[PDB]
Design an enzyme around this catalytic site. Structure first.
Site, PDB file in Angstrom:
ATOM      1  N   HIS A 114       0.876   2.204  -1.537  1.00 52.95           N
ATOM      2  CA  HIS A 114       1.800   2.380  -0.720  1.00 52.95           C
ATOM      3  C   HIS A 114       1.754   3.770  -0.562  1.00 52.95           C
ATOM      4  O   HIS A 114       2.290   4.372   0.494  1.00 52.95           O
ATOM      5  CB  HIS A 114       3.114   1.679  -0.618  1.00 52.95           C
ATOM      6  CG  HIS A 114       4.114   2.365  -1.747  1.00 52.95           C
ATOM      7  ND1 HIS A 114       4.363   1.801  -3.105  1.00 52.95           N
ATOM      8  CD2 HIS A 114       4.780   3.556  -1.777  1.00 52.95           C
ATOM      9  CE1 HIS A 114       5.116   2.641  -3.788  1.00 52.95           C
ATOM     10  NE2 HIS A 114       5.421   3.674  -2.960  1.00 52.95           N
ATOM     11  N   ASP A 135      -0.158  -3.567  -4.987  1.00 53.20           N
ATOM     12  CA  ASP A 135       0.089  -2.216  -4.796  1.00 53.20           C
ATOM     13  C   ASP A 135      -0.402  -1.342  -5.505  1.00 53.20           C
ATOM     14  O   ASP A 135       0.152  -0.866  -6.682  1.00 53.20           O
ATOM     15  CB  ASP A 135       1.718  -2.203  -4.730  1.00 53.20           C
ATOM     16  CG  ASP A 135       2.322  -0.727  -4.133  1.00 53.20           C
ATOM     17  OD1 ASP A 135       1.398  -0.150  -3.632  1.00 53.20           O
ATOM     18  OD2 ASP A 135       3.449  -0.476  -4.469  1.00 53.20           O
ATOM     19  N   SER A 149       6.617   6.403  -7.600  1.00 56.88           N
ATOM     20  CA  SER A 149       5.821   5.405  -7.316  1.00 56.88           C
ATOM     21  C   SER A 149       4.590   5.899  -7.929  1.00 56.88           C
ATOM     22  O   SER A 149       3.959   7.021  -7.766  1.00 56.88           O
ATOM     23  CB  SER A 149       5.654   4.982  -5.945  1.00 56.88           C
ATOM     24  OG  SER A 149       6.860   4.213  -5.476  1.00 56.88           O
TER      25      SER A 149
END
Ligand SMILES: Cc1ccc2sc([C@@H](C3=C(O)[C@](C)(c4ccccc4)C3=O)c3ccccc3)c(C)c2c1
Ligand SMILES: [Zn+2]
Length: 223
Positions: A45, A89, A179
């Site tokens: 992402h 992801d 992230s």
């Protein structure tokens, strides 16, 4: 990172600070980690029109000789990454050139489940609270691996694909800006930060990197 401590400077020399550039908004930020001298592993992402990687950082606002600012020449986002479920992801970034190995910059490969209840550590430069900016300094936090039922409320969570991380009793957690950062258990990378609640209440969801090691190896060998 919420509820963590400042890392000892340069004590996690594989950590990568990513600036994610898109054509229609300002920069966003992610973490990641160096797994080969020319590859960084991060979350899908975090893909963008272009990405810059800074290795060797501690305080990201203060240039120093340990910094290596490296160009990304190609993004390899997992071919099954799904923007709705957030399954798969994971992304590899190929660097233009191989990083220099220094005390402050080095790789963290991981080999071919860690049981719940174990404590693991995650680091990043992300936000330190819901209403707070990203940390200038690398932070880290010890989090509890949870049984998968603790993440049932993430309706697209799956135990075989993902780790459930952070005791809900505490505020300690990865958060926005973290992230792609690695979760290490006993010094070995087991997950990368993927997503969680906007209000930061743990647990959060991490990609289970064991599931993806064959894919990672296929990209590394072809490139
Ligand atoms: C507790 C807990 C832990 C990690 C996480 S990451 C996360 C959130 C997220 C952003 O917003 C950014 C900073 C981001 C978005 C796009 C490009 C680059 C950076 C990011 O990361 C998310 C959004 C879209 C998909 C997946 C995650 C949230 C809310 C979050 C919450
Ligand atoms: Zn330094």
């Amino acid at each position: 990172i919420i509820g963590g401590t400042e890392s000892k400077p340069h004590s996690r020399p594989y950590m990568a600070y990513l600036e994610i550039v898109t054509s229609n908004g300002p920069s966003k930020f992610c973490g990641g980690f160096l797994i080969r001298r020319n590859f960084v592993l991060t979350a899908a992402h975090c893909a963008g029109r272009s990405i810059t990687v800074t290795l060797g950082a501690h305080n990201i606002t203060e240039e120093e000789d340990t910094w290596q600012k490296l160009e990304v020449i190609k993004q390899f986002r997992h071919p099954k990454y799904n923007t709705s479920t957030l399954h798969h992801d994971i992304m590899l970034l190929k660097l233009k050139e191989k990083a220099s190995l220094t005390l402050a910059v080095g790789t963290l490969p991981f080999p071919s489940f860690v049981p719940p209840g174990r404590m693991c550590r995650v680091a990043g430069w992300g936000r330190t609270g819901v209403l707070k900016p990203g940390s200038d300094t690398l932070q880290e936090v010890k989090l509890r691996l949870m049984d998968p039922q603790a993440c049932s409320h993430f309706r697209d969570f799956d135990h075989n694909l993902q780790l459930c991380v952070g005791n809900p009793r505490k505020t300690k957690s990865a958060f926005k800006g973290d992230s792609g950062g690695p979760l290490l258990c006993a010094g070995v990378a087991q997950g990368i930060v993927s997503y969680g609640r906007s209000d930061a209440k743990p647990p959060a969801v991490f990609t289970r990197i064991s599931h993806y090691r064959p894919w990672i190896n296929q990209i590394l060998q072809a490139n």
